[PDB]
Design a protein around this ligand. Structure first.
Ligand SMILES: CCCCCCCCCCCCCCCCCC(=O)O[C@@H](COC(=O)CCCCCCCCCCCCCCC)COP(=O)(O)OCCN
Ligand code: SF4
Ligand code: SF4
Ligand code: SF4
Lengths: 153, 37, 24, 38, 122, 98, 318, 96, 121, 382, 57, 177
């Protein structure tokens, strides 16, 4: 019946939620907090998250820090070369929304102006666990995909 | 010799190759003719 | 290329503080 | 045979550290605001 | 058990010597394994929803004890939660459909989208 | 053939392309089979003891190949010309002659 | 045929080696590695795989399909065919070649092609020069591995790998020629890239250093290739120097002495050594690296052929 | 030679295996989700020479009980000429 | 006898005293080209005379340092050579003499500074 | 031959956008591109009060947070003449020095992860996640602890923080030793660092390095010995000063400066006077919650200090402390009003990253990441 | 402490794969041919195998 | 000079049984085996890691996370609309509009903190006179969509009633400072 489709979606989502390697656009301190979320205490290699250093092979892109109006084209160019089942996480106030620099001329009012965002880690310096919970919310966003059921319409 | 020690300090691996290799070019040179008994 | 190669020889490690160890 | 001259025995894993969790007021702090003469 | 598909196995590899300190309303069993070793790993929570669990399901009565901010188990702060305005937790339904997610008062998804025009038209 | 042709020589040639583009009745005698000599053993029983000078001469040919690849393709990238630009002050006019 | 029984288990070995490396190199860094996906991350390799398989391409580009869509196939086929002659236990080699060792040398000399071609088909000057540098490194620590194998060959009678592991019944060549094992390991580290010797594999310069059209299959096949080449070049430090499938020969009552289990234990030791030595040491910069394969591991390898030939010719130990 | 047929079929079966590993990603995931660096010629020619001399090492390695102390010294003369070439390359500076 | 100046780049000079005497004589000779009634010439003359004097009296570089308390003789040579550069520069674009108007506003404030701020020692 | 050498490992050096004009593998010139992290900090501070201005400073250098709040506070006390207590000074140093440790623990092992050593990064970051248990405990936020306010310091330490900082300092000599035994002895390290980015002292002075890159070259110049700006004139500590200037001296300094900072932490712990936490001048320091609620005159100041501000008198000073990166100084022109007036932030990394052009000339392309390593280039300050 | 066993487990299930690489191509060849594989299988042994299959008629 | 510096730095280690010490510590890589040994000691030691969702990192009652508008024990939002936090806010996240309610006591018709445009510096918690706005230790409120992240006027910041049991605890323990 549909049960086979439900289980193949569960399987695809388990894959894409188990191994989700983000191109960590670590601009600024939220990259230092992201480095703590990649560090020994809160493992991100535990949840499968492997910080890729290249946009070419990466399921996610944890943009962190102040997206400057000059690093906006570079972020967009990097986001355009991720393989289609990609997601973006905004980490820190400066990356998710205007932030401390909302009214700065050189700061875009949140990466939601350049890349379409799927989970905004909240808190200007998010606790390393908070970025980790943002990623555990991206995992939920994967677990709600069911792409096969939609391919069968 | 002072320069010999300066050469076995600055370049340990070409001065301990011409000595891990002497023991191979020296054993059959003299140690084998010694083994006439 | 005649560029200056990074010669990995140097003087031996000797922790060099400032003169203000005991009495400034 | 390594950096363990009976001094690395101060190891990172503490296991008894922040024994009094912060928001537990065993002693009520005072934190003086002004000098007594003022 | 029966979950070799999660890190829930790491928690269930804990609890071997741990003592159970209380259990909140939602079922989350709050454990404590002190004395043995590894400070920072001596207070956790078993979410009682072995699938579909996530953080923030830990109510405010325990979210103190469990982050080591206090030493008051939720069975002790439950005598301090205010009865008049006290509200149960909400699990942070972020994305799980509208009317569960939160909405501002102009989002056009919020029932009763208010109009902000300060001038009252004629 | 594999090694010293398609792991060295046609590697060279690939480099020269990529860069510098051009634009029943047998009677098996069971003697001599009691100790089967692998091809390496029955080349070494000869090349290094009996015909050893035709083996020390290819030694000299490999040495000449080393000297040749050095003197040819050092390409003025070491002491061949990296000695110095070279300059002498006393002969130098230093603005006396342009 | 039974080539499935040596490629499929090797595919599983590589897939679980990505996890073994992440997990061991993580344990080193005081942190549990992949630990949520499976019971202990045991399903994490399948998750990485099934993810890479389900990732839509960035551009289809199935037109250029004969140039660089079979070059990773070539690299991987070579890394897998060098496993035939590797014997896991007495009479468990798939094809006992009486010149087995030289065949491994030839397979490496063709892996050079694999790298060069798969780098030239990537029309990226930086990536192509990176692939050429990686090939020159893999081939400069091949004269040193060659001479190291000439040492372990002088000790043995023939190139037959089953003989090289049968010639160690008395003592493993790791005990007398330990300095050589250190040079074979430090060369197998450098022949393959995964090492203190991986500037072309500096985290970023690797991905942008093998190809331009990834499509995921290329990324996985290169890493599956690097990890099989690693299982292989660790299955050589354990045939030649360690006793291929030989116990310590104490003949215990508790131990019934299986052969392939001993070969497995030793290749696990050398894989764990690959990981440990990736964790604990800085990279060599490829400009000191090439000056270590010529100026350090070639003189110290030549000396060893003359030392293990001399000391075995004087006293008739040959 | 008789044992070469297993690897002869190994090449083809590994070709098949790699072709399947190639076709697996292709099937899934449907509609909806420097002028010249001559040192690379010097390093290359030098590997060529040193692999030629390893090719000459191999028979001398496997047959050294036969050539008692004379094949050894002839190979050591060949190796001293190798070493003179390698020292001329080291001093001239091709190993950089 | 000096092994090395701790400073990198300031190479130890063996003939410290001699080049110091040379530089200070050059400085005394070159400073004559600036007008006498300029604070710069009084300063140069005075300290160059003091250092040239103490360099002529003492012999070792260590005694030059000990009496002339100005660091190390290598840094002293750096200072003297930089001073020669400045005197040969000051000859050009001569800034000497006060112009006719010369409106100079000594905005000499004296705010009390708390001293847990840096200032200097 | 131009190469657009960008961020090799993102999340470590975020917006590094060098444009290297190479010569084969030898770099002939390195042209860094700035502005990719140019938030409007030197403009946004002109628009907010002296209190609202402080949080920008922990966001100026993101790996050494409180050092910049301490450099700003000392620039709004240089004007205010706001004498802070002894306990405020000792806490302020015990956290400026914990910040020196938090920075060298990152700027050493992030550098050591760019070079290739993967494990020192994670050991040092466990250490940093121990020190952020102090930041987060004393103020609230693990990284941006807007804690060193102009008058004194935000609020007193919790009643168990010195015991924990002690239990950390006892076990921190061993962590430095491990970071040292893993990197100092290695021949793969020395080779990757010795004679790399050597800066003769005249160059480190010319290019205004003034940091751990001015004590590599051998210029004994620490603004805690030169211009003692706190209890530093009471605290004993030796400033390690290099003798060659190569990136292996700057590493050895940053790994000794991480021990002298341990000495300063242990001193600040052992001698911390039980005094008031903020300056008694309640027109520069908002009164406590208890007082402003009970006292009407304190409530008025809590209102005019969290809305109006100080209105520090008209002046212009350059207060420079020894931040871990270097001499971080904040040139603070102050119109009489409650908002600053061109709060210019001299940040090392703007002067250091200039040095990349001449530091990495004729070094191999793989060294250009080692130079960026030892400069401690954090682009928030650039 | 037995904490390293979690990191030993992937090396085990990569060692349990080389055991399979070795024993599969052994018990597969031990099936097609009633006898194990002969490693030192020189031409004397192929000649004796020929004459042996010719002796059993 | 570097030539003479090399000559002398190599004539410092030039006495037999010291050239030998340095040769056996650069051939039998000995500096590196002390690296491998330490790395092994850490491979076998307990792991400083935290299986996050089940146990979380230590915090403090001063921890600044999700902003919550407190209430007085007897209902009645504590937030009299003084606008001090709207004034003190560095990022100007809080937008407060005030209206004399029918009861007569001032209250905020609009109290919207924009969490995305918010730096979590705790200035609002300090500036508020009655402790009306405090940061709850939540810090786990990552939202799928940005509009949810803008915390509405006194309705979602009114979810601090759930967090009051922990916020009241943190305030009762921090008020001593
Ligand atoms: C076995 C497991 C791995 C051990 C560590 C591998 C390290 C690889 C490089 C080792 C190496 O070659 O180090 C030195 C040589 O090591 C060996 O010979 C081995 C390099 O020369 P040097 O710097 O010591 O001396 C010359 C300095 N200019
Ligand atoms: S939002 Fe806050 S913590 Fe994140 S990068 Fe911006 S200033 Fe730093
Ligand atoms: S912490 Fe409070 S005052 Fe500071 S920006 Fe955020 S809402 Fe505004
Ligand atoms: S939250 Fe505090 S500062 Fe803001 S309006 Fe309410 S009482 Fe005033």
């Amino acid at each position: 019946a549909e049960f086979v489709i439900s289980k193949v979606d569960d399987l695809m989502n388990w894959a894409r939620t188990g191994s989700i390697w983000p191109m960590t656009f670590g601009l600024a301190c939220c990259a230092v907090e992201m480095m703590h979320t990649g560090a020994a205490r809160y493992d991100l290699d535990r949840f499968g998250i492997i910080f890729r250093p290249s946009p070419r092979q990466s399921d996610c892109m944890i943009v962190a820090g102040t997206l400057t109006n000059k690093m906006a084209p570079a972020l967009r160019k990097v986001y355009d070369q991720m393989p289609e089942p990609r997601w973006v996480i905004s980490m820190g106030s400066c990356a998710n929304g205007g932030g401390y620099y909302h009214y700065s001329y050189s700061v875009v009012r949140g990466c939601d102006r350049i890349v379409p965002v799927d989970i905004y880690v909240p808190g200007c310096p998010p606790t390393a666990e908070a970025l980790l919970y943002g990623l555990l919310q991206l995992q939920k966003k994967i677990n709600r995909r069911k792409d096969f059921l939609h391919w069968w319409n | 010799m002072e320069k010999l020690r300066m050469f076995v300090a600055q370049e340990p691996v070409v001065a301990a190759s011409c000595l891990i290799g002497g023991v191979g070019l020296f054993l059959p040179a003299v140690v084998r003719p010694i083994l006439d008994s | 290329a005649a560029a200056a190669a990074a010669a990995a020889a140097a003087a031996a490690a000797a922790a060099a503080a400032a003169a203000a160890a005991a009495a400034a | 045979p390594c950096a363990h001259p009976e001094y690395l025995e101060a190891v990172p894993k503490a296991t008894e550290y922040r024994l009094r969790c912060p928001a537990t007021i065993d002693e009520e702090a005072i934190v003086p605001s002004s000098d007594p003469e003022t | 058990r029966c979950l070799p598909d999660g890190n829930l196995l790491q928690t269930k590899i804990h609890n071997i010597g741990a003592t159970l300190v209380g259990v909140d309303k939602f079922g989350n069993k709050y454990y404590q394994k002190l004395g043995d070793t590894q400070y920072g790993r001596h207070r956790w929570v078993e979410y009682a929803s072995k699938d579909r669990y996530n953080a923030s399901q830990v109510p405010a009565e325990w979210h103190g004890w469990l982050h080591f901010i206090t030493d008051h188990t939720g069975d002790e702060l439950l005598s301090l939660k205010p009865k008049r305005y006290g509200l149960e937790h909400k699990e942070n339904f972020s994305g799980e459909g509208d009317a569960y997610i939160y909405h501002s008062k102009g989002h056009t998804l919020n029932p009763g989208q208010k109009n902000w025009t300060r001038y009252q038209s004629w | 053939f594999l090694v010293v042709y398609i792991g060295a020589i046609a590697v060279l040639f690939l480099f020269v392309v990529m860069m510098f583009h051009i634009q029943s009745l047998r009677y098996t005698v069971y003697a001599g089979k009691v100790r089967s000599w692998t091809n390496l053993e029955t080349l070494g029983n000869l090349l290094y003891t009996y015909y050893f000078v035709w083996f020390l001469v290819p030694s000299l040919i490999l040495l000449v190949a080393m000297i040749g690849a050095i003197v040819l393709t050092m390409h003025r990238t070491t002491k061949v010309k990296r000695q110095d630009v070279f300059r002498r002050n006393a002969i130098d006019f230093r603005r006396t002659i342009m | 045929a039974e080539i499935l029984g040596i490629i499929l288990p090797l595919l599983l070995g590589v897939a679980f080696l990505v996890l073994a490396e992440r997990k061991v190199m993580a344990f080193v860094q005081r942190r549990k590695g992949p630990d949520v996906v499976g019971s202990f991350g045991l399903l994490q390799p399948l998750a990485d795989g099934l993810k890479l398989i389900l990732k839509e391409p960035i551009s289809p580009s199935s037109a250029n399909f004969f140039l660089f869509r079979m070059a990773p196939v070539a690299t991987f086929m070579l890394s897998l065919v060098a496993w035939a002659v590797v014997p896991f236990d007495y009479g468990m080699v798939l094809s006992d070649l009486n010149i087995g060792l030289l065949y491994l040398f030839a397979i490496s000399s063709l892996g050079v092609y694999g790298i060069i071609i798969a780098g030239w088909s990537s029309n990226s000057k930086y990536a192509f020069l990176g692939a050429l540098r990686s090939a020159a490194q893999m081939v400069s620590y091949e004269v040193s591995i060659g001479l190291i194998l000439i040492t372990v060959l002088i000790c043995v009678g023939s190139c037959n790998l089953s003989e090289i592991v049968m010639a160690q019944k008395q003592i493993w060549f790791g005990i007398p020629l330990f300095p050589v094992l250190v040079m074979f390991f430090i060369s197998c580290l450098a022949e393959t890239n995964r090492a203190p010797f991986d500037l072309p594999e500096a985290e970023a310069e690797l991905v942008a250093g093998y190809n331009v059209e990834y499509s995921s299959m290329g990324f996985a096949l290169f890493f599956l290739g690097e990890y099989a080449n690693m299982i292989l070049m660790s299955g050589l430090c354990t045939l030649f120097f360690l006793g291929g499938w030989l116990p310590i020969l104490d003949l215990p009552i508790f131990k019934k002495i299986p052969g392939s289990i001993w070969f497995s234990i030793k290749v696990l030791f050398f894989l764990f050594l690959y990981i440990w030595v990736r964790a604990a040491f800085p990279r060599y910069r490829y400009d000191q690296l090439m000056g270590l394969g010529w100026k350090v591991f070639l003189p110290l390898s030549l000396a060893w052929v003359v030392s293990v030939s001399g000391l075995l010719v004087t006293f008739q130990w040959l | 030679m008789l044992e070469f047929a297993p690897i002869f079929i190994y090449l083809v079966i590994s070709l098949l295996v790699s072709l399947i590993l190639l076709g697996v990603p292709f099937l899934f995931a449907s509609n909806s989700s420097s002028r010249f660096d001559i040192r690379f010629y010097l390093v290359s020619i030098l590997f060529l020479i040193f692999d030629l001399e390893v090719t000459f090492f191999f028979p001398w390695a496997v047959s050294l009980n036969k050539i008692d102390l004379f094949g050894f010294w002839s190979m050591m003369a060949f190796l001293f000429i190798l070493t003179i070439g390698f020292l001329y390359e080291w001093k001239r500076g091709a190993l950089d | 006898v000096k092994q090395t100046t701790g400073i990198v780049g300031l190479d130890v000079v063996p003939n410290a005293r001699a080049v110091l005497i040379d530089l200070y004589s050059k400085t005394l000779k070159e400073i004559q080209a600036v007008p006498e009634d300029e604070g710069y010439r009084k300063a140069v003359e005075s300290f160059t005379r003091q250092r040239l004097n103490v360099c002529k009296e003492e012999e070792d570089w260590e005694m030059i340092e000990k009496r002339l308390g100005c660091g190390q003789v290598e840094e002293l040579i750096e200072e003297a050579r930089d001073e020669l550069t400045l005197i040969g520069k000051m000859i050009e674009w001569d800034p000497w003499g006060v112009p006719d108007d010369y409106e100079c506003e000594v905005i000499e404030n004296d705010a009390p500074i708390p001293k847990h701020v840096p200032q200097h020692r | 031959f131009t190469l657009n050498f960008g961020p090799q490992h993102p999340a470590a050096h975020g917006v590094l956008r060098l444009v290297l004009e190479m010569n084969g593998e030898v770099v002939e010139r390195a042209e860094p591109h700035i502005g990719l992290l140019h938030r409007g900090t030197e403009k946004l501070i002109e628009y907010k009060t002296y209190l609202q201005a402080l949080p920008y400073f922990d966001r100026s250098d993101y790996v050494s947070m409180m050092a910049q709040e301490h450099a700003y506070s000392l620039a709004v006390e240089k004007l205010l003449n706001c004498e802070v207590p002894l306990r405020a000074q000792y806490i302020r140093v015990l956290f400026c020095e914990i910040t020196r440790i938090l920075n060298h623990l990152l700027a050493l092992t992030t550098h050591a992860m760019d070079v290739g050593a993967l494990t020192p990064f994670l050991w040092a970051f466990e250490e940093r996640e121990k020190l952020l248990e102090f930041y987060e405990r004393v103020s609230g936020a693990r990284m941006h602890a807007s804690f060193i306010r102009p008058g004194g310091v935000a609020q007193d330490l919790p009643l168990g923080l010195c015991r924990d900082i002690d239990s950390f300092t006892q076990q921190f000599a061993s962590r430095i030793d491990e970071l040292e035994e893993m990197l100092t002895g290695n021949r793969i390290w020395k080779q990757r660092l010795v004679d790399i980015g050597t800066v003769t002292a005249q160059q480190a002075k010319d290019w205004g390095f003034s940091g751990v890159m001015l004590r590599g070259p051998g210029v004994c110049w620490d603004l805690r010995r030169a211009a003692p700006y706190d209890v530093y004139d009471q605290l004993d500590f030796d400033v390690p000063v290099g003798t060659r200037g190569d990136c292996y001296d700057r590493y050895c300094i940053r790994i000794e400066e991480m021990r002298q900072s341990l000495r300063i932490i242990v001193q600040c712990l052992n001698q911390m006077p039980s005094g008031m936490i903020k300056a008694d001048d309640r027109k520069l320091c908002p009164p406590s919650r208890c007082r402003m609620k009970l006292s009407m005159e304190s409530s008025i100041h809590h209102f005019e200090l969290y809305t109006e501000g100080f209105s520090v008198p008209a002046s212009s000073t350059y207060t420079a402390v020894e931040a871990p990166k270097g001499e971080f100084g904040v040139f603070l022109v102050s119109n009489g009003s409650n908002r600053p007036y061109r709060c210019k932030i001299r940040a090392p990394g703007f002067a250091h990253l200039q040095g990349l052009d001449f530091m990495s000339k004729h070094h191999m392309l793989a060294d250009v990441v080692t130079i960026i390593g030892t400069q401690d280039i954090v682009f928030g300050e650039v | 402490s037995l904490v390293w066993l979690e990191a030993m487990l992937p090396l085990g299930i990569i060692g349990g794969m080389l055991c399979i690489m070795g024993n599969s191509q052994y018990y597969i060849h031990k099936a097609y041919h009633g006898r194990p594989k002969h490693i030192g299988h020189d031409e004397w042994d192929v000649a004796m195998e020929r004459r042996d299959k010719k002796v059993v008629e | 000079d570097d030539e003479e510096a090399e000559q002398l730095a190599k004539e410092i280690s030039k006495d037999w049984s010291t050239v030998f010490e340095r040769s056996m510590n650069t051939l039998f890589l000995t500096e590196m085996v002390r690296g491998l040994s330490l790395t092994l000691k850490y491979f076998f030691d307990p792991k400083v890691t935290i299986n996050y969702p089940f146990e979380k990192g230590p915090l403090s009652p001063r921890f600044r996370g999700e902003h919550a508008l407190r209430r007085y024990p007897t209902g009645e939002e504590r937030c009299i609309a003084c606008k001090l936090c709207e004034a003190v806010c560095p990022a100007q996240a809080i937008t407060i509009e005030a209206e004399e309610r029918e009861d007569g006591s001032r209250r905020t018709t609009r109290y919207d903190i924009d969490m995305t445009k918010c730096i979590y510096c705790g200035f609002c918690q300090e500036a508020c006179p009655v402790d009306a706005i405090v940061e709850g230790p939540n810090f786990e409120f990552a939202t799928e969509t940005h509009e949810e992240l803008l915390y509405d006027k006194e309705k979602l910041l009114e979810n601090g009633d759930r967090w009051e049991t922990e916020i009241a605890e943190n305030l009762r323990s921090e008020s001593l400072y």
